[model samples]
Target: MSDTAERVKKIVVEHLGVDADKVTEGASFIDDLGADSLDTVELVMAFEEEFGVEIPDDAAETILTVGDAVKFIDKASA
Candidate 1:
């Protein structure tokens, strides 16, 4: 995993109470992360705070998987 993947995985593990080892690139936040709709929303909020960027709802909606979130953060930070 890349640095972005590592950071995103850490956040998911901490907030969603998921095992970090199980957090792979293909893991869906709602499914594999053991997150419900509200948890998913809160996870995105956590990501926004951690990355120091505002993720519009549409954009947030696009980040459904771990890979997607990592890609968005990497691009936004760059």
Candidate 2:
């Protein structure tokens, strides 16, 4: 829906080895995309660099889905 959303999806797809269509808003990283805790941590780090914002631990932990990542990045960038 936004540039940030698309970019987030790109990262998810590239990092998780999933199809682009699977990286939807409600798709859970661990449950749906097969990411472990460390994978999720690495992903948050990637997003911080890509979006130019340091996602705090509390916020990062809450990013359970692709939409959550996009929403948080959008808020941080705004």
Candidate 3:
């Protein structure tokens, strides 16, 4: 995994109270990680802070999965 992947895993583990091993690329934030709508928002907020970018509400709304978040962050950071 790349640094972004690792960092995302860490954020998921820390905020959602899940094991790092379980935060795979395909994991669903709500279904697999026991996250609610609020948790999802918090996760996005965390990512914004971690990546030093402001994820607009419209863009954030389109991000529904871990893969989406990773992809957006990777591209935004690049």
Best by lDDT: 2
Error of 1 at 30 (Å): 1.7
Candidate 3 regions with alpha-carbon error over 4 angstroms:
none
TM for every model, in the order presented, reads 0.83, 0.87, 0.83
Q: Candidate 3 lDDT, tens digit per residue, 1-78? A: 488888888877787677887777787787776667777777888898889986687776766678888787877887
Ranking by lDDT: 2, 1, 3
Give Cα distance to truth, residue 54, candidate 1, Å. Answer: 2.3
Q: Compared with the true structure, what per-residue lDDT tens digits does model 1 show for residues 1-78?
A: 388888989888887676987887788878875566676677777887899976678777787788888888878877
For model 1, the run of ten residues with the poorest summed lDDT: 32-41
Tell me model 3's lDDT, rounded to 2 decimals: 0.78
* lDDT of every model, 2 decimals: 0.79, 0.82, 0.78
What is the alpha-carbon lDDT of model 2 when measured against the actual structure?
0.82
- TM-score for candidate 1, residues paired by index: 0.83
